[PDB]
Design a protein around this ligand. Structure first.
Ligand SMILES: OC[C@H]1O[C@@](CO)(OC[C@@]2(OC[C@@]3(O[C@H]4O[C@H](CO)[C@@H](O)[C@H](O)[C@H]4O)O[C@H](CO)[C@@H](O)[C@@H]3O)O[C@H](CO)[C@@H](O)[C@@H]2O)[C@@H](O)[C@@H]1O
Length: 634
């Protein structure tokens, strides 16, 4: 008989092992996931007005939305056992399934109200004909603190997609408020043209009584992906039954992309999924003074297309401005991207679902945060969106996980030499100011939620490494490596201006022993942070289910003036390893997550890495081991 021994070689076929045998092998301890089973898209988050607690939601086992709550954003508690479900299919509006949805804190009966996609027909896919009535948007109300959502005893409040529009997908309603949208809509078509008159109205805007907007994601057959915008009828904040259609406030031509070569923001693909609408400043979230930001997943494919197969799942973001609808008979308001990028460059990262976290929340009160924040939760599919080549699912007993909660805001990059590196077309940043000599850049800021980061390094063991410089090729083991696979690695890599043209590759090797290693390094050839997983798992060679393809993201290191002197901006790294869940963060303006399913208990070594091409200076290298338990009650 075979009992799991991770100090010994892995069996050739993991899929032959007994159920639940691999349950803990690759399981994270500081991440959001159900007690067992599979987790899908994150949805339905809301900061309970009454208790100030923050509720988190996610599709679970493809049988509905499950929930959990937190008071500090560090630890979570399941709403209930047996799946901890909030709402499941089988109603009159959702006889087949319950898809993503979002919550209005003070809705029907003045309680948290869920607006979600109720499904009545399958299959549903952008590459095939759409069955009329497949997806409708229904309402459900929170009961018993929010441990359950009861569907309203009536049909959907948005019972059909736009009239006679051949949509590719009509789902994932996301609710939000906006001063600019209210102003542009409450104005005149001629008076809402001059930003002056407009801006003057936004100043007196009052959030408390503003109407809600709903953004539904999808696209149109033969046209392109799009976001369908609605709002409480007539701008009536008390109107929850009728939702007026404002049109396709954002659409792109089929498989087109941001930029001439789709370099910084993947492609718009064939269908938009899970549109989140944000309003960011330089400190957090503000629906009155914040710039419009939209995060979304796009479904793509190579040609020839294989019906019912989305080969590419990009987790994108875009920022821009909202204006009136021109002079055409189309959308009443329109979103125009000025810049776009990736919220996470991970192949398996997708469906980021976020929510405003008020400073008045119990979470922010405890941590002492004085501003409103926007926390986003990204999905890390466990099996490559179910296209994996025989992953040992029954053996693991669970599938997928959410990534660490992330704060999103406008991040600025100061003292940037205004050169070609900054003026390139179709990038993920805009210039905030400049004298043609140095400029301030503006882009999406991405950082681990502060309380979560604090919890990750509150009881961790700290081991630093001496600053180091590598010129010739070398792989240097740390003075002391962690003895577990639960740690946070931080480091700063400084490169010479001369490395830009070089074939330089510099980083670290982690989760390493003689038979295994995972490499993380910066590459100038394509200005990308890369995660080489070719040798990650000693079990991958005979178990194709464990993907081992290379992961990478674009990260441009600008020329800056740090000390009255020019230099290539410092690569500020933060790698969080929560067993197999690996999250690479950089300069607060970059995230790449993936699975690193190493097998041996001894694969915990960490080494400096340099390919000899060019030179690199490592500074402030440190390792915090341990992380923490995100689910105390389990
Ligand atoms: O879960 C619905 C939400 O998922 C999003 C974001 O990922 O897009 C999903 C999509 O692919 C899901 C998939 O299956 C899921 O639902 C099945 C039941 O419908 C369930 O059996 C699967 O176990 C579960 O993973 O759809 C097909 C099923 O044929 C499969 O290839 C997928 O992996 O769901 C839509 C419809 O099935 C597809 O158009 C889309 O790719 C978000 O947009 C949805 O709200």
């Amino acid at each position: 008989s075979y009992h799991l021994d991770t100090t010994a070689p892995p069996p050739t076929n993991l899929s032959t092992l007994p159920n639940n045998t691999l349950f803990h092998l690759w399981r994270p301890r500081a991440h959001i996931l159900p007690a067992e089973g599979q987790i899908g898209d994150p949805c339905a988050h809301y900061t309970d007005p009454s208790t100030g607690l923050f509720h988190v939601g996610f599709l679970h086992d493809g049988d509905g939305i499950a929930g959990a709550t937190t008071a500090n954003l560090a630890t979570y508690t399941d709403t209930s056992d047996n799946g901890s479900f909030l709402i499941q299919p089988g109603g009159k509006n959702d006889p087949v399934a319950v898809f993503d949805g979002a919550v209005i804190p003070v809705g029907v009966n003045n309680t948290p109200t869920l607006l979600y996609t109720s499904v009545s027909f399958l299959p549903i896919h952008w590459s095939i004909p759409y069955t009329r009535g497949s997806e409708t948007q229904s309402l459900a109300v929170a009961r018993d603190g929010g441990r359950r959502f009861d569907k309203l005893d009536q049909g959907p409040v948005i019972a059909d997609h736009p009239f006679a529009v051949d949509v590719t997908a009509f789902r994932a309603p996301f609710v939000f408020r906006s001063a600019r949208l209210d102003v542009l809509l409450s104005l005149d078509e001629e008076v809402a043209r001059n930003e002056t008159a407009v801006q003057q109205a936004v100043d007196g805007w009052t959030e408390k009584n503003a109407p809600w907007y709903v953004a539904v994601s999808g696209g149109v057959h033969g046209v392109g992906p799009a976001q369908f915008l609605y709002r409480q009828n007539g701008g009536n904040a008390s109107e929850f039954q009728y939702w007026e259609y404002l049109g396709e406030w954002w659409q792109e031509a089929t498989n087109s992309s941001w930029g001439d070569e789709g370099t910084w923001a993947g492609r718009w693909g064939f269908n938009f999924e899970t549109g989140n609408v944000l309003f960011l400043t330089e400190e957090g979230h503000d629906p009155q003074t914040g710039e419009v930001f939209v995060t979304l997943g796009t479904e793509g494919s190579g040609l020839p297309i294989v019906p019912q197969v989305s080969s590419i799942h990009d987790m994108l973001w875009a920022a821009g401005e909202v204006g009136v609808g021109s002079e055409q008979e189309g959308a009443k308001v329109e979103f125009s991207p000025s810049m776009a990028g990736f919220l996470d460059w991970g192949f398996s990262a997708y469906a980021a679902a976020g929510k405003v976290l008020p400073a008045s929340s119990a979470v922010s009160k405890t941590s002492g945060v004085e501003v409103d924040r926007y926390v986003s939760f990204v999905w890390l599919t466990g099996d490559q969106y179910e296209q994996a080549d025989g992953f040992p699912t029954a053996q693991q007993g669970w599938t997928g996980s959410l990534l660490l909660p992330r704060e999103l805001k406008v991040q600025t990059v100061e003292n940037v030499v205004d050169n070609e590196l900054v003026r390139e077309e179709g990038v993920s940043w805009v210039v905030g100011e400049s004298d043609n000599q140095t400029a301030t850049l503006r882009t999406l800021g991405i950082t681990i939620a502060r309380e979560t980061k604090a919890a990750l390094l509150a009881n961790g063991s700290v081991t630093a490494e001496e600053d180091r410089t590598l010129q010739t090729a070398a792989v240097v083991p740390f003075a002391q490596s962690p003895s577990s696979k639960f740690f946070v690695l931080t480091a700063q890599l400084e490169f010479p201006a001369s490395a830009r043209s070089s074939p330089l590759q510099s980083g670290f090797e982690i989760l390493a022993s003689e038979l295994e290693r995972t490499a993380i390094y910066y590459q100038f050839s394509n200005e990308s942070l890369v995660v080489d997983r070719s040798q990650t798992s000693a079990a991958a060679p005979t178990n194709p289910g464990l993907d081992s393809f290379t992961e990478s993201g674009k990260l441009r290191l600008f020329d800056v003036i740090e000390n009255g002197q020019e230099q290539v901006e410092t690569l500020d790294l933060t790698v969080v390893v929560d067993n197999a869940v690996v999250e690479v963060y950089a300069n607060g303006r970059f995230a790449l997550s993936t699975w690193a399913r190493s097998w041996y208990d001894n694969s915990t070594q960490i080494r400096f890495f340099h390919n000899g091409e060019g030179e690199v200076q490592f500074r402030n290298v440190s390792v915090s081991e341990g992380l923490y338990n995100a689910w105390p009650e389990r």
